[PDB]
Symmetry: C3
């Protein structure tokens, strides 16, 4: 029964660790959204200064790629949570 | 007492699935970093033409290095996930 | 005893996998600081051409927060990783 006790201890820490990883993925999702936003504001001002100086700054796809990736990480966060719960049931 | 063997298998299954999702997450971050590096280049270029010189050369190159490291990580992880999956009894 | 051998193999690779993930998180943490730095430089220069208004102060401070937070996760995870490693029978 050294094995069964070791297994539950392992599973408990494996569950906590995937929970920690899940947070890092969350913080990364948010950091990525924050960047998308920064590119957004940059896109505005630089194009306004480009209009008062009268090259177009176009970051729309970079912006949308980043908000998509950010959403994708959220899917992962959800799918991971399901798996974490499953691990916890053993 | 072979509830323990049944528990071990389900656990390994979800751990394999869980590390696989985490690898998707890392892959998405790596590519996102390339997206940003691209974004920084465009910003650098456009701002210098409207013109202090905006120099993002080091940030851009740091970011593609980080992206390369993350990819290397994903490849290395993929092997380990399989090792884990072979342990089902 | 077949199960315990499988258990050890799994735990060993699970420990390796979490270490690979921890590298990824570390690399991501550092990339975010780099992003924050670049956004800072963009702000200065863009605001400087603006006087001859771009506000990114909070995003920069957000990204440096996430970056610090990511490091706290890694260091906590290493404690959990060792716990996993101690279970080897």
């Amino acid at each position: 029964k050294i094995l069964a006790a070791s297994f539950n201890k392992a599973m408990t820490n494996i569950v906590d660790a995937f929970t920690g990883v899940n947070d890092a993925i969350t913080q990364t999702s948010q950091a990525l959204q924050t960047v998308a936003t920064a590119l957004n504001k940059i896109q505005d001002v630089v194009n306004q200064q480009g209009n008062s100086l009268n090259t177009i700054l176009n970051l729309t796809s970079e912006i949308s790629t980043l908000e998509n990736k950010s959403a994708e990480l959220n899917y992962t966060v959800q799918k991971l949570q399901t798996l974490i719960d499953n691990i916890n049931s053993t």
